[PDB]
Design a protein around this ligand. Sequence first.
Ligand SMILES: CCCCN(c1cccc(-c2ccc(SC)cc2)c1C)S(=O)(=O)c1ccc(OCC(=O)O)c2ccccc12
Ligand SMILES: CCCCCCO[C@@H]1O[C@H](CO)[C@@H](O)[C@H](O)[C@H]1O
Ligand SMILES: CCCCCCO[C@@H]1O[C@H](CO)[C@@H](O)[C@H](O)[C@H]1O
Length: 255
Amino acid sequence: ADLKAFSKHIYNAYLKNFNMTKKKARSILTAPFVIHDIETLWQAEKGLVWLPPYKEISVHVFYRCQCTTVETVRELTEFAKSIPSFSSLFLNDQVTLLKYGVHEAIFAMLASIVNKDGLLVANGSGFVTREFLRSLRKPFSDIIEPKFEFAVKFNALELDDSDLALFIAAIILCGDRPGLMNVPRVEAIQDTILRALEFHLQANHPDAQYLFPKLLQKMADLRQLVTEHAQMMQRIKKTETETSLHPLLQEIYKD
Ligand SMILES: CCCCN(c1cccc(-c2ccc(SC)cc2)c1C)S(=O)(=O)c1ccc(OCC(=O)O)c2ccccc12
Ligand SMILES: CCCCCCO[C@@H]1O[C@H](CO)[C@@H](O)[C@H](O)[C@H]1O
Ligand SMILES: CCCCCCO[C@@H]1O[C@H](CO)[C@@H](O)[C@H](O)[C@H]1O
């Protein structure tokens, strides 16, 4: 009943806080400058499309990834704060939820800007090919591929921005997070969001392909995806000594 209005407030918060909507993304994807080799990557840097001291091609890509990720974390923070029930939480719990939730949300939203062939970069000014990213030296290519596999299956669910606003909110407001102080309040908020989501999916996808429980599965898939990604990020930290890691991302991964 009150859930329809509750979803509108979340959707509003999403529209207010993210630079790239799926609506914007899909329209661009169907012109952005194409990065498919070293030459085009260099031409993208020469101002036409767009940091620590230069090392190499794969590390340059890794550095630009961090920049993007840091910026997405900022947006997710503002999104979450635009939800009143999130803002009533003590700041430590807010930080705990963002700590353990941002990468799950990042990979979910990433599907919005991805097709079988590649992904948009630089606020839609660029399109980097999947084949080009495959060509980067290990471990970077290994880290990248699973996100394509995830994003393609996820895009088959044909969610829109209003669906995603609730889905991301549910990811952030998660009672399972380690070190959470007020577990009961968060669980109660999660439950309201999930109820709003099921209600919203009924109204928005009337002939739903068992859509709500498939999204719950995707949430579990995202948790596994982040687990594996964190393991791969630990490998970078251990093996790539000369490569710098953004302080905030270091804080997120810590413990
Ligand atoms: C669907 C493929 C996603 C691949 N990764 C990603 C995500 C967003 C932007 C970019 C990117 C690509 C090209 C350029 S210029 C040629 C710039 C950016 C990439 C590679 S990823 O989502 O798998 C990914 C996410 C985050 C990473 O480190 C940051 C963090 O964990 O906070 C990644 C690090 C290495 C490889 C992929 C990363
Ligand atoms: C908004 C995203 C912030 C995620 C970084 C959280 O970083 C966390 O901050 C806590 C409070 O300073 C620290 O106690 C904790 O050690 C650190 O991992
Ligand atoms: C931008 C790259 C920052 C990632 C550095 C990874 O850092 C590591 O992540 C592990 C997670 O497996 C944590 O257990 C460990 O404490 C942390 O130092």
